[PDB]
Swiss-Prot record, chain A:
Nucleoporin essential for nuclear pore assembly and fusion, nuclear pore spacing, as well as structural integrity. The gene is NUP210. Recognized by antinuclear autoantibodies in primary biliary cirrhosis. Knockdown of NUP210 causes nuclear membranes to accumulate aberrant structures termed twinned and fusion-arrested membranes and nuclear pore complex to cluster. Induces cell death and chromatin disruptions. This is Nuclear pore membrane glycoprotein 210. Belongs to the NUP210 family. It is found in: Nucleus, Nuclear pore complex; Nucleus membrane; Endoplasmic reticulum membrane. Coiled coil: none annotated. N-glycosylated, but not all potential glycosylation sites may be used. Contains high-mannose type oligosaccharides. The chain crosses the membrane at residues 18-38.
Swiss-Prot record, chain B:
One of its GO terms (cellular component) is actin cytoskeleton. InterPro entries: Nucleoporin_prot_Ndc1/Nup. Belongs to the NDC1 family. Component of the nuclear pore complex (NPC), which plays a key role in de novo assembly and insertion of NPC in the nuclear envelope. Required for NPC and nuclear envelope assembly, possibly by forming a link between the nuclear envelope membrane and soluble nucleoporins, thereby anchoring the NPC in the membrane. GO terms for molecular function: protein-macromolecule adaptor activity; structural constituent of nuclear pore. Disulfide bonds: none annotated. It is found in: Nucleus, Nuclear pore complex; Nucleus membrane. Residues 1-23, 89-113, 186-224, 293-548 are cytoplasmic. Keywords: Membrane, mRNA transport, Nuclear pore complex, Nucleus, Phosphoprotein, Protein transport, Translocation, Transmembrane, Transmembrane helix, Transport. The keyword Ligase does not apply. This is Nucleoporin NDC1. The chain crosses the membrane at residues 24-44, 68-88, 114-134, 165-185, 225-245, 272-292.
UniProtKB/Swiss-Prot annotation, chain C:
Widely expressed. Particularly abundant in cerebellum, corpus callosum, adrenal gland, pituitary gland, gastrointestinal structures and fetal lung. This is Aladin. Its main location: nucleus. SMART domains: WD40. It comes from Homo sapiens (Human). Pfam families: Beta-prop_Aladin. SUPFAM superfamilies: DPP6 N-terminal domain-like. Keywords: Acetylation, Cytoplasm, Cytoskeleton, Disease variant, mRNA transport, Nuclear pore complex, Nucleus, Phosphoprotein, Protein transport, Repeat, Translocation, Transport, WD repeat. GO terms for cellular component: centrosome; cytosol; membrane; mitotic spindle; nuclear envelope; nuclear membrane; nuclear pore; nucleoplasm. WD repeats lie at residues 39-77, 80-119, 131-171, 177-213, 221-277, 283-330, 339-379. It is linked to Achalasia-addisonianism-alacrima syndrome: An autosomal recessive disorder characterized by adreno-corticotropic hormone (ACTH)-resistant adrenal failure, achalasia of the esophageal cardia and alacrima. The syndrome is associated with variable and progressive neurological impairment involving the central, peripheral, and autonomic nervous system. Other features such as palmoplantar hyperkeratosis, short stature, facial dysmorphy and osteoporosis may also be present. It is found in: Nucleus, Nuclear pore complex; Cytoplasm, Cytoskeleton, Spindle pole; Nucleus envelope. The modification N-acetylcysteine is found at residue 1. The keyword Transmembrane does not apply.
């Protein structure tokens, strides 16, 4: 046990549902901020 | 069930995403792209030796490429993405000014602003955790093995609470809470558009030096205030966490931070201040980038290049009553096109086939006149409100008002309910920037039509324009005679937060006189043929003769 | 054009009264902060002249005059009452600028601040109160040498040779927006184009910078031998005249109109042009050889674009180093022309200290001349 090495890869498994939820929220975001597009730009 | 009947609440968001939001995504990407520059600088400042400067640099780079720093960097990037999303939920185009001290308290106690304060406190605790790990050493871990039990008797290696790591985490939570409180108190959620548009890199390179100076001073005040808070309350988290985890306390190796001679530890105070500088600087970089991208101009076509794009078009955008950031961007473009592009003025004066009607002008002028008359009535209703000085629901109202009229009679509570005159005056003009651009837009188009309007289209509405401008100038010059309606608010020069909204009422009175003077200087004596009221003609002569 | 194409100066003791039929009719009468203001003032001897600045109001027969005592006086053709402006911060006045689209607002450049005076246009008291004087200042922007309002009345600019950033002021919101560039010197003079789309900014160095009022972009002009001393825009904003200290040359630089979308670039032609020479010539007069030529210290164009007045300063081998006023006739279309008209001359022993045109004179043009005698003359040019 360090302070370190170990926060990388455990949290990547602990938080995987939040990582996918935030990825899908950013993809919905960016889609849901492109649709407001080809009739005001 | 029940996917039917709300299409307008798509299209309106489906006009906002177009525009404002590749601008959001670019702001988020740049906020993450500055994070390596903040973490490199944080590691270089936390590793300072003054005696071995070559090893200080060596070992700062040795940590930088370590797999453990590449993690906390990915975790910190998620924190900066979420803080950038919270700037996109909580923004305001009109400043939410509290007209009384009870309205300021009622703003802070609002459940969405409380939610923002809890989420920023959690993100401040996570960012301080990453930082306390990034600094290594005594700041490492919340739990540490007891460095004293040479007493042969059991081999369970005993666990102490790391009070320094607890002080780091709790400072991070207090800094995140304090940032959220300051965000709604200073109106940092306000988007003041710049009086001068400028390339993004110059606008940022100028603000960054002011920001790093502000973060350094604000971190020093937050650490000083937290040091006082911990001296009165630090025992409560300390005793709650030791009991909740059955952790011991090392009364032999470490002086407790409840004591003035532990809490004055200069190495702790330096690394905790530096953590607060990294926190405030990365969070304010996200806010400044968002504020730059969300107050960059936009250009709206006046005539549609293709029929399907025509929701796009400036005259339809204005009339649609769109989200206030779009209605502000459209009026900012109207104020830019009317000064700086003759071809886009000829798009406004053009007659739309087949029917020969000036639909572009008669949309733009009509909504500018709606806004100006809306401000005239908003001023009249405030002058009147300055000259005048089932049974359960009406029972609740009568009890609420009997309670007001008992609470107001108590000096200590009158001191909270009192309507600050300056704040109520600033609340009337809180949206006046929209009305300045409608006015500057229209009065430039009325100045240009004297050489560009081959159809006389603008001279058909000139009498109605002059009537609404003169009756608005009357409402402004009846209003500016009121007590405190003429006094200028005291300003601090070089603040990172802007205060333009406080003086904006003098800008509206100044722009209205220049807008009337512009029209009297382009039409001159031809205005003597204009049908208007005898008091309005008598004022129009005073703007020809230069008497105002 | 060249000085060898001018008609002779008027015979010694006559004064030029007016222009008529294109002829000039004559008759018998009508550093520290302070040395740094004297290096960059529009007045040929600012440190000894009684008169430090003159400025017409952009629409009315009203004018402002800065004096050696740091008074500003205001005169009006419809008032015998002359207001005397004196604030506690009013010291070493360098520039005056009236606000366009306003009867009542004057900006004043001082050693320590800018003063915006408000003057009640019907009730012109002899000494208005120190409350009628809004103070603007910024740490390091001192002394202020030049002031320039935008034609639309909503923005003011200020210059300081110490400060590597033009200061834009909104006088109504009381905001200050520096425009910092990356080395070169500070700012000496500032001139808007009449459209309000462009701004010339000069420096103490052999570089000037032109700016765009839409996107606040900057276009650099570094192939000069000396400093840009003075310049003037054409009435359409399509041409900029300028002169270089050490060169007897009037340059002209063109800017074609934005028949195209999508970029803030200031948009000048890749080269300037030489249009008039001011080299050291002789002219024959009834009084002998007169010698003419030197350096153009000030240039002012009429609102109509038909008359350019040039305040030349002789070298100390030519008329003892006296200043002289040249009058050119100008054309802006289809070609840019400078034709000679003649030489403007005053009281025997007076030297021209300042020149400027009237902005709203309904009978050709009207040239205000400030003389070393402390007299102001107003010379009409009838066309």
């Amino acid at each position: 046990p360090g302070p370190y090495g170990a926060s990388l890869f455990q949290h990547f498994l602990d938080s995987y549902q939040v990582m996918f939820f935030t990825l899908f929220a950013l993809l919905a975001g960016t889609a849901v901020m492109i649709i407001a597009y080809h009739t005001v730009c | 069930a029940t996917a039917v009947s709300r299409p307008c609440a798509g299209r309106s968001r489906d006009i906002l995403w177009r525009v404002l939001g590749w601008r959001i995504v670019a702001s988020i990407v740049w906020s993450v792209l500055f994070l390596p520059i903040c973490t490199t600088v944080f590691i270089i400042f936390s590793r300072i030796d003054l005696f071995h400067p070559i090893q200080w640099l060596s070992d700062s780079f040795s940590d930088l490429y370590s797999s453990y720093v590449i993690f906390y960097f990915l975790l910190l990037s998620v924190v900066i993405i979420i803080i950038s999303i919270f700037n996109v939920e909580f923004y305001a185009v009109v400043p939410s000014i509290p007209c009384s001290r009870l309205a300021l308290i009622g703003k802070i106690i609002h459940p969405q602003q409380l939610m923002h304060s809890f989420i920023h406190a959690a993100m401040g605790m996570v960012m301080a955790w990453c930082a306390a790990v990034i600094t290594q050493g005594q700041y490492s871990f919340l739990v540490v093995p007891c460095t004293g039990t040479n007493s042969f008797g059991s081999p369970a290696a005993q666990t102490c609470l790391n009070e320094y790591h607890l002080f780091f985490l709790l400072t991070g939570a207090f800094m995140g809470y304090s940032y959220s409180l300051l965000y709604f108190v200073n109106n940092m959620n306000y988007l003041p558009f710049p009086i001068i548009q400028q390339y993004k890199f110059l606008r940022f390179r100028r603000s960054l030096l002011l920001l790093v100076k502000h973060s350094c001073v604000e971190s020093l005040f937050l650490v000083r205030n937290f040091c006082i808070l911990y001296y009165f309350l630090g025992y409560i988290p300390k005793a709650w966490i030791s009991t909740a985890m059955n952790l011991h306390i090392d009364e032999q190796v470490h002086r407790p931070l409840d004591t003035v001679s532990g809490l004055l530890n200069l190495s702790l105070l330096y690394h905790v201040w530096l953590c607060g500088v990294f926190l405030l600087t990365t969070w304010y970089v996200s806010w400044i980038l968002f504020k730059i991208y969300a107050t960059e101009a936009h250009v709206f076509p006046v005539q549609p290049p293709f029929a399907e794009g025509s929701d796009e078009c400036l005259p339809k955008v204005l009339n649609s009553n769109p989200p206030p950031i779009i209605k502000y961007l459209a009026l900012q473009d109207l104020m830019l096109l009317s000064q700086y592009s003759p071809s886009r003025r000829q798009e406004v004066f053009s007659l739309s086939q087949p029917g020969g009607h000036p639909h572009n002008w008669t949309a733009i002028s009509r909504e500018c006149l709606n806004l100006l008359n809306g401000m005239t009535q908003k001023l009249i209703l405030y002058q009147e409100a300055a000259a005048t000085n089932s049974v359960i629901y009406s029972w609740i109202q009568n009890k609420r008002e009997q309670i007001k009229n008992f609470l107001s009679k108590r000096v200590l509570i009158m001191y909270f309910f009192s309507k600050h005159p300056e704040a109520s005056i600033q609340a009337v003009f809180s949206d006046a920037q929209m009305h300045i651009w409608a006015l500057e837009g229209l009065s430039h188009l009325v100045a240009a039509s004297f050489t560009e309007d081959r159809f006389g289209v603008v001279q058909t509405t000139l009498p109605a324009i002059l009537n609404t401008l003169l009756t608005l100038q009357e409402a402004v010059d009846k209003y500016f005679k009121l007590p405190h309606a003429s006094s200028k608010p005291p300003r601090i020069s070089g603040s990172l937060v802007d205060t333009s909204y406080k003086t904006l009422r003098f800008a509206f009175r100044a722009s209205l006189k220049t807008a009337i003077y512009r029209i009297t200087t382009t039409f001159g004596e031809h205005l003597n043929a204009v049908q208007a009221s005898a008091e309005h003609q008598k004022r129009l002569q005073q703007f020809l003769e230069f008497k105002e | 054009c060249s000085l060898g194409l001018f008609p002779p100066p008027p015979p010694r003791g006559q004064v030029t009264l007016y222009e008529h039929n294109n002829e000039l009719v004559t008759g018998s009468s009508y550093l520290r902060s302070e040395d740094l203001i004297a290096e960059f003032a529009q007045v040929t001897n600012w440190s000894s002249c009684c008169l430090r600045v003159f400025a017409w109001h952009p629409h009315t027969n009203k004018f402002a005059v800065a004096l050696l005592d740091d008074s500003v006086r205001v005169y009006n053709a419809s008032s015998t009452i002359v207001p005397s402006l004196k604030h506690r911060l009013q010291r070493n006045v360098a520039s005056l600028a009236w606000k366009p689209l306003s009867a009542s607002v004057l900006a004043v450049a001082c050693q320590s601040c800018i003063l915006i005076w408000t003057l009640d246009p019907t009730s012109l008291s002899t000494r208005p109160s120190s409350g009628c004087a809004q103070v603007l200042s910024h740490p390091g922007h001192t002394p202020v040498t030049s002031l320039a309002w935008a034609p639309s009345g909503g923005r003011l600019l200020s210059a300081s040779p110490v400060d590597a950033a033009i200061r834009v002021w909104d006088v109504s919101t009381e905001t200050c927006v520096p425009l910092p560039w990356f080395r070169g010197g500070g700012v000496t003079n500032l001139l808007w184009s009449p459209d309000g789309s462009k701004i010339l900014a000069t420096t103490p160095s052999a570089v000037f910078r032109v700016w765009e009022a839409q996107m606040w972009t900057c276009e650099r002009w570094p192939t000069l031998s000396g400093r840009c001393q003075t310049g003037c825009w054409s009435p359409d904003g399509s041409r900029l005249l300028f002169t270089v200290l050490g060169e007897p040359l009037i340059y002209s630089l063109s800017f074609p109109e934005r028949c195209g979308e999508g970029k803030g670039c200031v948009g000048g032609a890749k080269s300037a042009t030489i249009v008039a020479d001011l080299s050291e010539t002789t002219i024959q007069t009834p009084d002998g050889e007169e010698r003419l030529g030197g350096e153009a210290h000030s240039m002012v164009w009429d609102p109509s674009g038909e008359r350019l007045a040039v305040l030349m300063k002789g070298k100390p081998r030519v008329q003892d180093g006296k200043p002289v006023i040249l009058l050119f006739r100008t054309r802006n279309s289809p070609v840019f022309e400078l034709l000679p008209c003649g030489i403007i001359q005053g009281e025997p022993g007076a030297q021209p200290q300042l020149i400027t045109f009237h902005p709203s004179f309904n009978k050709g043009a009207l040239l205000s001349v400030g003389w070393s005698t402390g007299r102001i003359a107003h010379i009409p040019l009838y066309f």
